[PDB]
Amino acid sequence: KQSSAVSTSGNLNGGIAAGSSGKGRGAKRKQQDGGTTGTTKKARSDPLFSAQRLPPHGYPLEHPFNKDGYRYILAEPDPHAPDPEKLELDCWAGKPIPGDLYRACLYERVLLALHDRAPQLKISDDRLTVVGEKGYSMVRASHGVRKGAWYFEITVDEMPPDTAARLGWSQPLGNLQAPLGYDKFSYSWRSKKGTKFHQSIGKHYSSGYGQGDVLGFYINLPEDTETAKSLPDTYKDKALIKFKSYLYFEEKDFVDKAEKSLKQTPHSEIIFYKNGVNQGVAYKDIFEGVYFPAISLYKSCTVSINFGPCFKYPPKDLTYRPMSDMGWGAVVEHTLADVLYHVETEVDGRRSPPWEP
Amino acid sequence: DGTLDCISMALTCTFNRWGTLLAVGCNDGRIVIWDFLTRGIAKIISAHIHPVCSLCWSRDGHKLVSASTDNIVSQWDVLSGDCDQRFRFPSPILKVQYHPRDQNKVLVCPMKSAPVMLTLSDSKHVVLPVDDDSDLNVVASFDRRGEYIYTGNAKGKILVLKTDSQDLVASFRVTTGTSNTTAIKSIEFARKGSCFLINTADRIIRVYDGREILTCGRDGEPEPMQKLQDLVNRTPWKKCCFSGDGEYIVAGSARQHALYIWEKSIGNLVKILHGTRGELLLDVAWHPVRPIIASISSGVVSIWAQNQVENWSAFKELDENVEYEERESEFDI
Amino acid sequence: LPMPMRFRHLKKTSKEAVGVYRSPIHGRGLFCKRNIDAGEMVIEYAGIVIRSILTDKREKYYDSKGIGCYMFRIDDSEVVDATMHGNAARFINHSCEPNCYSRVINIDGQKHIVIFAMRKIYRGEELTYDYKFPIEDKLPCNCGAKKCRKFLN
Ligand SMILES: Nc1ncnc2c1ncn2[C@@H]1O[C@H](CSCC[C@H](N)C(=O)O)[C@@H](O)[C@H]1O
Numbered sequence: 001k002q003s004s005a006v007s008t009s010g011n012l013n014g015g016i017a018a019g020s021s022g023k024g025r026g027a028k029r030k031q032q033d034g035g036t037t038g039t040t041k042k043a044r045s046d047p048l049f050s051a052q053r054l055p056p057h058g059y060p061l062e063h064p065f066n067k068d069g070y071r072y073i074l075a076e077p078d079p080h081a082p083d084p085e086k087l088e089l090d091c092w093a094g095k096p097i098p099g100d101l102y103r104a105c106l107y108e109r110v111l112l113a114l115h116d117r118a119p120q121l122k123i124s125d126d127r128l129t130v131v132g133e134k135g136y137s138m139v140r141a142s143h144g145v146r147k148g149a150w151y152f153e154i155t156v157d158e159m160p161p162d163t164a165a166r167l168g169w170s171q172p173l174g175n176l177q178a179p180l181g182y183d184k185f186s187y188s189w190r191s192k193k194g195t196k197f198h199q200s201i202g203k204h205y206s207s208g209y210g211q212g213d214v215l216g217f218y219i220n221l222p223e224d225t226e227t228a229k230s231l232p233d234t235y236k237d238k239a240l241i242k243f244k245s246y247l248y249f250e251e252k253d254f255v256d257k258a259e260k261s262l263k264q265t266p267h268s269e270i271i272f273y274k275n276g277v278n279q280g281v282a283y284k285d286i287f288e289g290v291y292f293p294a295i296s297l298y299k300s301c302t303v304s305i306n307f308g309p310c311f312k313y314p315p316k317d318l319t320y321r322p323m324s325d326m327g328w329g330a331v332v333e334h335t336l337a338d339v340l341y342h343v344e345t346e347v348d349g350r351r352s353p354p355w356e357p
Numbered sequence: 358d359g360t361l362d363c364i365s366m367a368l369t370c371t372f373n374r375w376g377t378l379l380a381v382g383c384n385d386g387r388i389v390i391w392d393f394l395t396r397g398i399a400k401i402i403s404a405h406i407h408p409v410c411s412l413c414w415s416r417d418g419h420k421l422v423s424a425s426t427d428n429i430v431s432q433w434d435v436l437s438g439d440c441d442q443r444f445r446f447p448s449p450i451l452k453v454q455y456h457p458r459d460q461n462k463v464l465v466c467p468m469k470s471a472p473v474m475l476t477l478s479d480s481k482h483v484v485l486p487v488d489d490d491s492d493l494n495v496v497a498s499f500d501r502r503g504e505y506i507y508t509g510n511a512k513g514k515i516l517v518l519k520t521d522s523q524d525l526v527a528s529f530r531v532t533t534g535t536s537n538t539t540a541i542k543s544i545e546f547a548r549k550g551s552c553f554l555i556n557t558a559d560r561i562i563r564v565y566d567g568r569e570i571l572t573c574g575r576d577g578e579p580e581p582m583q584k585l586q587d588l589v590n591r592t593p594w595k596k597c598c599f600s601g602d603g604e605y606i607v608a609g610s611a612r613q614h615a616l617y618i619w620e621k622s623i624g625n626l627v628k629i630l631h632g633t634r635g636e637l638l639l640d641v642a643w644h645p646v647r648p649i650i651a652s653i654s655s656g657v658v659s660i661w662a663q664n665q666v667e668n669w670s671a672f673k674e675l676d677e678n679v680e681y682e683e684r685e686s687e688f689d690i
Numbered sequence: 691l692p693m694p695m696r697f698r699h700l701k702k703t704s705k706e707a708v709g710v711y712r713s714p715i716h717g718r719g720l721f722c723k724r725n726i727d728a729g730e731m732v733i734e735y736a737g738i739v740i741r742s743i744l745t746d747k748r749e750k751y752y753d754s755k756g757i758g759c760y761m762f763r764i765d766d767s768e769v770v771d772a773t774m775h776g777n778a779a780r781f782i783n784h785s786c787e788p789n790c791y792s793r794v795i796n797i798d799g800q801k802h803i804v805i806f807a808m809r810k811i812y813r814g815e816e817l818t819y820d821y822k823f824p825i826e827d828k829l830p831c832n833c834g835a836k837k838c839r840k841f842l843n
């Protein structure tokens with residue numbers, strides 16, 4: 001309400017368009033020894049310190065979850081995107097590409113991302129179950145599908161009568177306080193009777209659900225060709241912030257789409273299984289945009305997502321991919337995204353192979 | 358909490374059977390029968406030239422017994438105001454009391470002599486017995502039904518007689534704790550149930566249940582239902598009374614012109630009402646079927662009511678914030 | 691004093707501290723019945739604590755019923771809706787010069803919107819605070835203050 005000037009918080013200011021290329025002037029270059037963060041190349045220890053795990057569900061206490069179309073991710077220093085070699089005779093040959101950052105994820109495996117949960121959403125990493133207290137809420141996994149066919153599961157550990165979880169997929173723009181299907185960008189199942197919920201509309205084109213159901217979830221979206229028919233460029237936003245005691249990265253998320261025309265992604269579908277037994281097709285009409293597996297809680301619902309290598313009734317398809325596979329695929333993809341952005345800003349020129357892949 | 362300018366020299370008041378009228382005595386010796394609903398005086402009776410210090414309604418409400426300071430007792434029809442009967446005694450009368458179940462009969466507590474029970478049909482009188490023969494100051498009262506007579510002396514002795522035979526049906530002396538007696542200031546009963554109270558010279562009100570005295574027999578040790586006092590100020594009580602139901606008890610601190618309100622079962626102090634620091638508290642009464650309390654102080658009457666949450670607070674009124682209970686289909690179509 | 695203890699005291703004294711009467715500001719409003727000190731708890735805007743996402747569904751609902759919305763934003767996630775269930779705080783007018791101010795407190799985990807006194811408020815005074823209503827395109831104000839914006843918005 002003042003002017004096109006300094007950011008809304010004096011805690012950290014990013015370089016405005018008039019202060020272009022202003023890197024986040026957060027912590028000073030003068031660091032303390034510390035000792036705990038003095039890991040070297042000879043030691044074998046994961047620098048991403050996961051919090052203490054507790055059998056009772058807990059809350060991430062100092063994480064400002066996504067809002068206003070503003071995505072929030074973990075940050076690590078990464079003082080140099082590694083390009084160190086011998087001192088070449090030409091002192092103007094190589095570029096260090098000092099991004100001084102990375103999207104390192106606080107996860108041993110592809111799990112339910114804590115960055116995209118509601119403040120009323122509790123997790124227990126003993127089974128990575130998710131639970132709530134009042135009404136409905138939504139959580140999502142770490143990964144997100146953009147093409148191909150894949151598959152995961154949800155295991156339900158507690159379903160009292162006043163406890164009805166919902167399980168399915170949701171694109172970004174999905175308000176994580178809504179019950180996973182209240183908008184047109186989410187398609188789920190209600191875990192009282194198998195009922196497909198989308199646009200808050202319930203449809204009985206489905207089988208029946210059981211209290212101890214280990215439910216399999218198969219979903220096939222077309223390649224990014226039929227998804228976009230154009231450039232699927234991924235120019236990323238990256239902003240450095242130093243929240244109360246830790247460094248984090250902000251990126252710009254998508255905006256609420258007013259899409260009211262139906263253009264289904266070609267040959268995309270969703271299939272639901274009960275313990276591998278085909279519960280049937282859920283949604284053939286699938287809108288564009290990346291999707292991610294999501295779970296909605298009612299009052300005190302206990303469910304958990306699960307990947308493929310520890311499966312119970314897996315499909316024997318050679319094309320579908322477990323949660324972990326697409327997870328590390330997207331992780332490596334965002335690594336290359338950081339690489340390319342630091343290249344763009346740091347070294348003149350860019351170049352990519354024969355487009356098709 | 359609301360006074361009346363239309364009456365002067367208020368000295369003693371008495372509710373009718375249903376708490377609709379209030380007969381107040383005045384220093385001129387007049388009865389002012391004032392109405393609650395119309396909030397106006399209903400009748401004026403030239404009772405005595407002498408102020409009236411004792412007033413009681415009849416059960417039908419058509420008779421009022423009045424006692425002048427001239428030792429002149431007189432019965433008056435409330436519709437006409439005529440002196441139905443008139444009697445005079447020695448040892449000026451301290452109190453009169455219609456019999457609750459026989460308005461023909463009326464007990465009278467005089468100053469120095471024993472209380473005597475008279476009838477209106479026949480101008481006879483039955484002198485009630487006195488234990489110690491030397492009290493010279495014994496208050497007496499009918500019970501709720503008029504079946505027994507409770508007489509308390511200046512020496513803490515308490516006799517329960519039967520109203521018809523005057524035979525000693527129970528007895529006990531109250532204690533000051535250690536070993537001493539105390540002047541029985543007054544005996545009050547509940548219009549509902551059987552709990553009654555005693556105001557004594559120790560400034561300590563003692564609440565009992567008459568059945569326990571009856572089963573205690575003569576010369577026993579009945580404990581009170583409750584013991585009530587101002588542990589803070591140690592204030593005497595000029596006049597006390599139950600609530601209409603009998604679960605609230607009020608005492609009038611004439612020392613500081615205040616009103617203490619305790620409960621019956623627990624006995625904890627409900628509240629305190631403060632009057633004009635310059636007013637001398639004289640008389641206290643409770644509305645028999647309302648949380649309304651009449652006070653007579655320095656010849657002026659004040660009214661103390663108690664209202665509910667409504668009269669402006671009645672959407673659906675709530676007191677504290679309510680977390681909405683979201684449903685399963687709360688977002689469903 | 692502890693916010694819980696202060697809140698208990700406020701909920702005990704609220705019924706006898708304030709009243710509602712005919713108001714020269716507009717219609718009926720909240721007046722002071724006992725001299726209120728500065729910063730002390732005047733009144734809770736008690737009501738139905740709901741989440742923000744359910745506001746519109748309620749609002750349109752009231753819009754379908756012709757019943758005025760009595761909602762105050764607790765925060766970006768919660769709202770006290772007093773349209774159907776509330777307290778006397780639904781009769782606090784606004785003044786550009788308020789002797790009161792709204793603050794959100796946390797008691798035992800639940801948030802309460804309490805109007806406290808910006809200054810020492812005396813008996814008979816009408817209670818008013820800053821609604822801080824965003825600028826629309828116009829509600830005239832009759833608060834009587836010399837600094838009055840002529841419009842809440
Ligand atoms: N300061 C002010 N200036 C102009 N209008 C005001 C006002 N304060 C309150 N109002 C009006 O009064 C209404 C209060 S809703 C209460 C209705 C009415 N006063 C009653 O007591 O029944 C609002 O809708 C608003 O339009």
Ligand SMILES: Nc1ncnc2c1ncn2[C@@H]1O[C@H](CSCC[C@H](N)C(=O)O)[C@@H](O)[C@H]1O
Pocket residue numbers: 717718719720758779780781782783784785829830831832833842
């Ligand atoms: N300065 C102002 N101008 C116009 N309306 C106002 C106002 N201040 C308060 N209001 C009214 O206050 C209401 C919201 S809260 C209601 C409090 C109001 N005193 C009452 O008696 O109901 C609105 O409907 C609006 O009509």
Ligand SMILES: [Zn+2]
Pocket residue numbers: 784785786787831832833834835838
């Ligand atoms: Zn104003």
Ligand SMILES: [Zn+2]
Pocket residue numbers: 784785786787831833834835837838839840
């Ligand atoms: Zn104003």
